[PDB]
A paper describes a structure:
Carboxylesterases are a family of enzymes that act on a variety of both exogenous (e.g. cocaine, heroin) and endogenous (e.g. acyl-CoA esters) substrates. Carboxylesterases comprise three distinct domains; a central domain containing the catalytic triad (S221, H467 and E354), a regulatory domain (RD) and an α/β domain. The active site occupies a 10-15Å deep hydrophobic pocket at the interface of the three domains with all three catalytic residues arranged such that a proton transfer chain can be established.
The HEK Gnt1-/- mutant cell line in which N-glycosylation is restricted to GlcNAc2Man5 was used for generating stable cell lines. In all three structures, the asymmetric unit contained one monomer of hCES1, containing, two disulphide bridges were present, C87- C116 and C274—C285 as seen in other hCES1 structures. In the crystal structure of hCES1 and hCES1 S221A, an N-acetylglucosamine adduct was observed attached to the side chain of residue N79. Space group symmetry was used to generate the biological trimer that is seen in solution. Superposition of the monomeric structures showed no differences between the glycosylated and aglycosylated hCES1. The orientation of the side-chains of the catalytic triad (S221, E354, H467) in bound and unbound enzymes was also identical showing that the enzyme is pre-disposed for substrate binding.
Author numbering:
A (entry chain A), B (entry chain A), C (entry chain A): 21 to 552
Write the structure that this text describes.
């Protein structure tokens, strides 16, 4: 059993065979395949260029570096979200435009399996492909799993609001990886005519952005957004991006005389200087002093005129997006622990009175975008029904989650539905055994909790209950069925209704069953509140 | 009245409407339109590259930076030459390849007005387009006024005398702006088939250089050189440019091992380091210790084999230049105050004996190029007729002016005439009220004094006499008539004869009238003196 | 007699006429003609790019810089090997892609003389073209002599073992100069259809590498390797080059996270930093502490997939190489003084016992590649026949020479012969009067000793005996005859048999005569020892 070697457009790559319990045949894995030229030097803040071809056989058996990011938050996220038994050491580099492939196909024969391309999350600031082991999903469901990387943070999203640094470099990377998949995936036994993009959090927003982008035409055939869409407004910068660009430049020690000056100066800084700039900006944290409307906890997607021609809201109203089957889902308690913990969010005392709730909601402006005049109505609605300050804290977490994830996700699915595309929603409500031990036991369906199920963590890690094992089997089959057919349903599975005018969705957890009208009262409350 | 928005080849630009007293309709102004890619990084000391196109609408309502230059001399020149009521704050940057447009045309209709493209002065070392407000000229004469920028100083003119840094980058910028005008000016209501280039001092030399250059073919149809031509020898470096190149490199902290080494090293220096290099070289100053033949108060035009194929003298003798109508003029006292003040020239004591005159003329070698053996004849001719040391100083200033401006200008006009082209000359003899208060009251027709009239300073600034107002009206109409027709004459205007074999020219001032044989005895004296 | 001016593809070049005693007509010399763009900045560790064309006439009368290298070893080598009367001052620069031409042809008439292109030696770490004056060879034999430069050391040979820095930049330079010769040499009176490559030491290995390379197709018609071939294993790195690449990066102060990171970081270092890196690595020295198998005294040729598709041994076994006439030769005592002196090799005490011999042979692993288990047999064979420790030292020097030069050269000639190509060998056995005064008088046919004869040092330097004069005349005629005809023989010359199955070769020295079976017993001993 000599190792698997296949042809890419840029030359040959060598992978490794790995076995999984319960399967007679191994899965072929390829780690660290480049899909573009490393974006170093003058290639910073420019679109991804094609990779240089290589002679002989590239050894693709080592994990690539993760894109430069805060190593504290980035390592923490990898540890909390990995489906693998052990945490892998990951290097940081600007040289990070790699993908990893897991294929169960026999590479000596023509195979055209459905391909699932995973776009990780981490607020467009942190994260790695290598965190997510495709082995279980590939073997259990007979799909090719591709995990991709894309530039993060300053490297990925620096925008001057004009032609000197349009922005969205990370998204163009995601597009470039999808073009690589079109050109190459058949050598790995994948069907370039059946590509499903899926991602969580910022990866779900990225998926949503690709559904909105003419650059992504002909590159995918199904989409799945898990806890994140293009209406998750913390990730999309509308209006004037030039003052945040200037703040970044000034922090880096660059003059702000013109756009071209700022971008040129930043292209001169070392990786290290830019990482120090990143840390000094205190991204992924809330500012508790200063005008909340000027606070930017992350850099993000911009309306650049190449990837996105208008705002997501405008493109939606026009029905100008790709009408592929789209599954959009949320977890029950999206702001229950993970996100506030990662942001060092002030709610640690375990309780909240209504006056404190109101100033904190105001400080939370970059996350929720609620004008100071709307704060009292918003707060009263969620917290005003109880005098218990412990329960006020919990309802406050629901408020944040509803505004960041629940409402945006339902709005996106309704528009997608009304454009005539097949649409499905879920709400995931389970507390995984793989949860952090600092996470309170009452938090069920936290941000990220579905990832263990989707990626088959019970098959790779120790300690899963029988119920968790079955939950993962069901979720993987739903997801792969959707990749195959644009419909997650099939034999042995609870019925998942289409999200049509009755708004059927699947509640996923210990008691998986269909329900209707996910977040309906919350969409009505918020959209009408925001409309003055 | 929504703001004016028009299409360029690189995308849409938004300007602003501005009103002028006595005109019912406003003028559309566009500030800071890029005509090339910012020449940063590896684009230093290389020709201008095309601008990157932009999405959406570029807001062209802020003044661009001026090209990097000594801020003392550059700010001073802007204050002394601006026709505007107030001094505008200007930034310095290498990112300076912009132009500003003033158009009186209705941009919703096809308009094809004559276009006048202004090339500012400042010894190819300082200056800015934004100094010159086109509003009055555009409204009074119904022309499109374009003020352009071009690289200055080291950035603009660094030459190794070979293919690694040919030089004349500022001139190729001027050519690139003219190509932009050809491609775009119709959207601004201009006639690309009627473009007049005009400039003063180094801008007049630039105009003269374009008349001599095959690169400028088909780019303009009339020319005007005000106090500066390609025979103003201080601006043109013939012979060996490599020792000044080496001195620049050494000052910057670069090795001089080869040409390519020097240019590559200089491309690594920060803007600031190069500006510090500029100041340490003491450009725009006379060296009063050391061999005057090695003194270089400015970098300048070189014979690079692309822009200029031979020396101006050789091209003239061959009649190898563009035979467009050309107006060439001087002021009465070109070295009366402005230039010696800007150069910290030694003549401040108000008088000069004949022995001191002679060593000072020798120190003035980079300005006048008079061999030490010719000094006594030159000095005797100008100063030898009086024993009054005050009047010796004044005749000495005439000597300098005659050699730098008067003689060169007449030689250029005679050659242009003898090639069969329409040619006109003027001598401007007026002391503007806008003169500096440090300028002695006896100086009339100083370097720059015509600019107030040409640009309609009486219509924008406070304090002009009725006579100044009429002088500007006359000068603007002469200039615009020339732009339209290649002949400045028209109804209501004093008769301006062609510069033909009788050498008629116009004396412009309080008593505007025709005369003959401008500087005839001075051309005879100097050309024969220089011919040993 | 105005100076010679000729047309190249990139523009005109001006040379100088130089006279040589005994010749009525001068030789035209051109020094410092560029054949590529200077490899500065982003062009480091990339193939040579075409030179930028120039206007007017390039003055080619100054020696170019030598490629950046250790100035101690590089200056020393130039002084020891120059055939010229005096040592010329040479600058160091990365800007070094120049060649020098010596032509005896009348440049006003069509001349098509044989061209001999010299590739200097210096272990791919040091050396210069300008060291070798082509004047005598050009005049005596009526050939055009071209001496070329190529990148050395880190600049020339840095390889990551993949597509981010393939390596062999110096060899691609050699190829680029040969393409320049094809395109241009006719203007210098040379026949582009008769080009002979010749070189010594690393230059002989380079010649051998070109015979093995599909890139060199159609670029030469005869080859001569003097004391160096592609089987001189110290110059060719097989197996894993990544740890030496990492050591270089670490020494330079670069991270080793990925290949692209290392190469990008090294492209940021100044020439000086890289030269300091070079010196800190102690190239051209033996490491007397540490594992000899990890010791790298030079960077070298790699199997890059562009220049060399497989190992030299593999290409030979396949008969996949250019079957041009090839003369391969060695000197009698290749390790007699020059090389051990340049490497600060431990054998200075003048004697060697057998136990010390054995550990020193082990330390010499990077030069000879003899596995520790083979050491006792190798040492016994050479030193075991005498108890005289002085003679043991001399036999030890023979051992090294046989493994580095003698055996490899004969193997190469046998393979070339067996492919059906015309092949000739020599062994040079003379002690030049131009030898260093530190060289012991008993050393005859040291590394480099033939260069004086080949380049006509007796005609340019002082002090040659009549016999040396005749030896040089004979050697130059043999070499030039070979350039003309692929056969060195001719009237007035001792008979030089073909290297056929009888293995005839020429012993060159005071008594020049044919012999047979050069190093036959040594090839048998070593090839069978290495085959376990
Ligand atoms: C590929 O690389 C791994 C290290 O990641 C190494 O162990 C393995 O030997 C390599 N395989 C081949 C065939 O070179
Ligand atoms: C254009 O920029 C100016 C500042 O220079 C600003 O005041 C104005 O609002 C801008 N106009 C538009 C339409 O954005
Ligand atoms: C060429 O350069 C040399 C210096 O290397 C100089 O002496 C000679 O004058 C030059 N020749 C010409 C014609 O410029």
């Amino acid at each position: 059993s000599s190792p698997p070697v296949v042809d890419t457009v840029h030359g040959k790559v060598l992978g490794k065979f790995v076995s999984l319990e319960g399967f007679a045949q191994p899965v072929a894995i390829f780690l660290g395949i480049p899909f573009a030229k490393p974006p170093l030097g003058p290639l910073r803040f420019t679109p991804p260029q094609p990779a240089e071809p290589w002679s002989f056989v590239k050894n693709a058996t080592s994990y690539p570096p993760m894109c430069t990011q805060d190593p504290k938050a980035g390592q923490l996220l990898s540890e909390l979200f990995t489906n693998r038994k052990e945490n892998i050491p990951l290097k940081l580099s600007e040289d990070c435009l790699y993908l990893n492939i897991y294929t169960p196909a026999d590479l000596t024969k023509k195979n055209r399996l459905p391909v699932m391309v995973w776009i990780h999350g981490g607020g467009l600031m942190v994260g790695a492909a290598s965190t997510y082991d495709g082995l279980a999903l590939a073997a259990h469901e007979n799909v090719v799993v591709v995990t991709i990387q894309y530039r993060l943070g300053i490297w990925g999203f620096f925008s001057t609001g004009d032609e000197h640094s349009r922005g969205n470099w990370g998204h163009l990377d995601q597009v470039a990886a999808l073009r690589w998949v079109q050109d190459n995936i058949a050598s790995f036994g994948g069907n370039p005519g059946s590509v499903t993009i899926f991602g969580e959090s910022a990866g779900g927003e990225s998926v949503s952005v690709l559904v909105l982008s003419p650059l992504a035409k002909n590159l995918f055939h199904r989409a799945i957004s898990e806890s994140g869409v293009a209406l998750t407004s913390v990730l999309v910068k509308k209006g004037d991006v030039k003052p945040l660009a200037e703040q970044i430049a000034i922090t880096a020690g660059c003059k702000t005389t013109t756009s071209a000056v700022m971008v040129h100066c930043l292209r001169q800084k070392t990786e290290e200087e830019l990482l120090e700039t990143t840390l000094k900006m205190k991204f992924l944290s809330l500012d508790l002093q200063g005008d909340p409307r000027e606070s930017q906890p992350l850099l993000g997607t911009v309306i650049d005129g190449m990837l996105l021609l208008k705002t997501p809201e405008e493109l939606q109203a026009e029905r100008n997006f790709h009408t592929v089957p789209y599954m959009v889902g949320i977890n029950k308690q999206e702001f229950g622990w993970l996100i506030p913990m990662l942001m060092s969010y002030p709610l640690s005392e375990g309780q909240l009175d209504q006056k404190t709730a109101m100033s904190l909601l105001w400080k939370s402006y970059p996350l929720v975008c609620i004008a100071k005049e709307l704060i009292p109505e918003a707060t009263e609605k969620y917290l005003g029904g109880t005098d218990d300050t412990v329960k006020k804290k919990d309802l406050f977490l629901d408020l944040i989650a509803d505004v960041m994830f629940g409402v945006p996700s339902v709005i996106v699915a309704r528009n997608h539905r009304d454009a005539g595309a097949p649409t499905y929603m879920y709400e995931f409500q389970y507390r995984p055994s793989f949860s952090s031990d600092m996470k309170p036991k009452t938090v069920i369906g936290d941000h990220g909790d579905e990832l263990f199920s989707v990626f088959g963590a019970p098959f790779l890690k120790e300690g899963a209950s029988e119920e968790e094992i079955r939950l993962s089997k069901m979720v993987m089959k739903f997801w792969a069925n959707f990749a195959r057919n644009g419909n997650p349903n099939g034999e042995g599975l609870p019925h998942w209704p289409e999200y049509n005018q009755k708004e059927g969705y699947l509640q996923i957890g210990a008691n998986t069953q269909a329900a209707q009208k996910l977040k309906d009262k919350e969409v009505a409350f918020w959209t009408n509140l925001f409309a003055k």
